[PDB]
């Protein structure tokens, strides 16, 4: 091990060169770049005196609970749903899934027995790594969370099956399409299984989490399978929830939310949210509904986006690759989709890793901050967020982040 | 009244028998703006355009911020003359963080209470009448056992408030404290600051100051908005209120944008909760709003606008009730300087009768007891009514056929 003497003095000499460059770069922001939001600069007039739905009704006025039909319509189509078992509502949809659960806990959803907040615990599944605004929601609620792991067509359905027999789990987190981080996108087989299974709790709901329904890097969409007609066709029709929004296609925090489900699933919600409120923003659905015409030119506006972003990841991927490959030192997602790179390190370095980064002025999320609590068991995970910053910085932080993870590699 | 009312027998039968040939079709149900106020923010429709940030230079397109804008907040701070820094801006509905308020309450308390709504055997909450339904509804939903309070011409009968708060279970009260829905007055200084400086049995004790019509004058003079966040300060009960008001009857009902203002200790409570829910409220629609109002100015040159609009409506109404039944002692009426509604009470036991022999003759009057909780008004008496949105021709023969059907159901009983 003549060659490992070698390799860290090597290596130092790189993290000395990299903290010497004294940057101020950061991995960590989720987010559409100022390029991607360019791209909505219409929207921002809209609806002009154009105030009015195709139908003749006056957006200015009271009234209507589950969004237009305009917007509706439109996004049904794109998502391959009836414009019925859609619902479109204000600028977020965490709103949404945080309302679905505080009213579950609150007075029970359409096939609870008892309120949630009636149980003696209430556990909830998390595949991980996953979002942590998930599961800050279920932390929020004191739901006992229960990590499964992913694998690359979906969760670990072994898991998911044994543990779905504790009539206490009473749900599950998703991301099914280019999901946050780990870029997977679940297959066919895996959503019929989920919509299949028998689960010990009668009232057992998914969140389908579909945030990234529409979002590819190259020039194919991915099929998003009707998991809702799935669960009908098997008996259980009310097991997803279906969450998609325009976040990261228009304005992200001023776009159009949507809620999916079983129509007993949608009456339910609606005698909640009749009460919450009169209905959401339909001046902004409009907005939306005019700026895209239509699902060709929505899937248009996504292409634009996929090219914004494509040359962002194949450079990172590329540095990956060339920076850590043959060092057997790190695993990482090629995402073929989405807004994230989920990275594994050598166990036990994650932590080592960011605070090796920040210290050189590489800003990189908290280690373990995809996993329940902020707790990674093996310290191995870094997620990696590239949409916002130009290639040029990204090269930089990304040259930097693979000596940063050789350096910790390399200090045990 | 009784006496000269009877001898108007066969000419109300008549008025009656004219008013059902006439084959009407009209409305005075909707507490909406009518499409000419709408079109007073046209303007409105068509920002922020390219001009997306805020003044500080925040781009309002990505994500961030859950509090809402500085712009708009400094703004409607301003405009009602509460501390920007106590002034939360959301998205377009004030009804959902009222929900939004006694929800969180409901499931993991407030922050002062010791445990949390759901937990206990009943909660008793404070119901002003005639009150507004959307409020009641919220709290028959959480399953609260409403109790009503009697409202005079300057607020809620601040003796039996008193009493009533004595009980621990009582953890809460609707108020509609300016230009009140559906009674048009507004709560007294007095009452306001008996409100803040009276002991609640319980430590936890709410009040929904639902500012809805804070600035919505029929005349060309604003009412006072009474600080009772500093009034709760100075009186040492610092969070008992939570502020309420919107812009839905100002630019866009159901696309507008809502606050919350509170202490800084409420604000930081919802924070929490509302920081688990989402990270933030519409910032684009938030900074049209800026944009649109410029400054307070600019606002209540708006509101006075909006005035112009319904003044004649609601002068109209008020000399056909006068001229049209004032002699028969068989309606009282509230003669509002602004908001939305007039409350008549007719005779007791009749309400329900008014409604229907109305509906007959083709014309829609909000249900019998919809301002009180439960739909129960237990005198029969009350009816709202709601001039905003018809032109002043079909609200004059509304409100002529309405004054028939009082007439015509006092000679039933
Ligand atoms: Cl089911
Ligand atoms: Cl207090």
């Given at each position: 091990?003549?060659?490992?003497?070698?390799?860290?003095?090597?290596?130092?000499?790189?993290?000395?060169?990299?903290?010497?460059?004294?940057?101020?770069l950061?991995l960590?922001?989720?987010?559409?770049?100022?390029?991607?939001?360019d791209?909505?600069?219409?929207?921002?007039?809209?609806?002009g005196?154009?105030?009015?739905?195709?139908?003749g009704?006056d957006?200015?006025?009271?009234?209507?609970?589950?969004?237009?039909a305009?917007?509706?319509?439109?996004?049904?189509?794109?998502?391959?749903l009836?414009?019925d078992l859609?619902?479109?509502?204000?600028?977020?949809?965490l709103?949404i899934?945080?309302?679905?659960?505080?009213?579950s806990?609150?007075?029970?959803?359409n096939?609870?027995?008892?309120?949630w907040?009636?149980?003696?615990?209430?556990?909830?599944?998390?595949?991980?790594?996953?979002?942590?605004?998930h599961?800050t929601?279920?932390?929020?609620?004191?739901?006992?969370?229960?990590?499964?792991?992913?694998?690359?067509?979906?969760?670990?359905?072994?898991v998911?099956?044994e543990?779905?027999?504790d009539?206490?789990?009473?749900?599950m987190?998703?991301?099914?399409?280019?999901?946050?981080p780990?870029?997977?996108?679940?297959?066919?087989?895996?959503?019929?299984?989920?919509?299949?299974m028998?689960?010990?709790?009668?009232?057992?709901?998914?969140?389908?989490?579909?945030?990234y329904?529409?979002?590819?890097?190259?020039?194919?969409?991915?099929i998003?399978?009707?998991?809702?007609?799935?669960?009908?066709?098997?008996?259980?029709?009310?097991?997803?929830?279906?969450?998609?929004s325009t976040?990261?296609?228009?304005?992200?925090?001023s776009?159009?939310?949507?809620?999916?489900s079983?129509?007993?699933?949608?009456?339910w919600?609606?005698?909640?949210?009749?009460?919450?409120?009169?209905?959401?923003?339909?001046?902004?659905?409009?907005?939306?509904?005019?700026?895209?015409g239509?699902?060709?030119?929505?899937?248009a506006?996504?292409?634009?986006?996929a090219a914004?972003?494509?040359?962002?990841?194949e450079?990172?991927l590329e540095?990956?690759?060339?920076?850590?490959?043959?060092?057997?030192?790190?695993?990482?997602?090629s995402?073929?989709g989405?807004?994230?790179?989920?990275?594994?390190?050598?166990?036990?370095?994650?932590?080592?890793v960011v605070?090796?980064?920040?210290e050189?002025?590489i800003?990189?999320?908290?280690?373990?901050?995809?996993?329940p609590?902020h707790?990674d068991?093996?310290?191995?995970?870094?997620?990696?967020?590239p949409?916002?910053?130009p290639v040029?910085?990204?090269?930089?932080?990304?040259?930097?982040?693979?000596?940063c993870?050789?350096?910790?590699?390399?200090?045990?």
């Open positions: 091990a003549a060659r490992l003497a070698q390799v860290r003095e090597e290596v130092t000499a790189k993290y000395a060169e990299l903290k010497a460059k004294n940057l101020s950061d960590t922001r989720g987010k559409p770049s100022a390029e991607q939001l791209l909505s600069n219409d929207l921002l007039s809209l609806p005196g154009d105030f009015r739905t195709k139908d009704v957006c200015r006025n009271y009234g209507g609970l589950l969004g237009i305009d917007i509706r319509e439109l996004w049904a189509e794109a998502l391959g009836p414009a859609v619902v479109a509502q204000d600028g977020s949809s709103n899934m945080f309302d679905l659960i505080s009213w806990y609150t007075w029970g959803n096939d609870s027995s008892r309120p907040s009636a149980e003696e615990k209430v556990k909830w599944l998390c595949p991980v790594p996953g979002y942590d605004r599961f929601i279920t932390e929020h609620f004191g739901f006992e969370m229960i990590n499964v792991p992913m694998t690359d067509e979906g969760p670990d359905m072994g998911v099956r543990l779905v027999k009539p206490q789990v009473k749900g987190w998703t991301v099914p399409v280019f999901g946050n780990t870029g997977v996108t679940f297959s066919e087989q895996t959503c019929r299984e989920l919509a299949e028998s689960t010990a709790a009668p009232d057992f709901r998914i969140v389908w989490d579909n945030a329904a529409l979002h590819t890097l190259s020039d194919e969409f991915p998003v399978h009707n998991v809702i007609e799935f669960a009908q066709a098997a008996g259980n029709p009310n097991r997803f929830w279906f969450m998609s976040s990261k296609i228009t304005h992200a925090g776009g159009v939310s949507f809620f999916a079983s129509k007993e699933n949608i009456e919600y609606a005698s909640h949210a009749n009460v919450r409120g009169i209905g959401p923003n339909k001046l902004n659905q409009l907005a939306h509904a005019q700026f895209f239509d699902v060709a030119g929505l899937k506006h996504m292409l634009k986006h914004s972003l494509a040359p962002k990841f450079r990172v540095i990956l690759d060339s920076r850590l490959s043959e060092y057997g030192v790190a695993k990482w997602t995402p073929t989405g807004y994230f790179i989920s990275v594994d390190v050598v166990p036990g370095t994650a932590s080592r605070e090796l980064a920040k050189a002025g800003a990189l999320t908290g280690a373990g901050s995809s996993f609590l707790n068991p093996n310290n191995e995970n870094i997620r990696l967020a949409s916002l910053p040029a910085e990204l090269e930089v932080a990304m040259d930097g982040f693979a000596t993870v050789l350096m910790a590699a390399l200090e045990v």
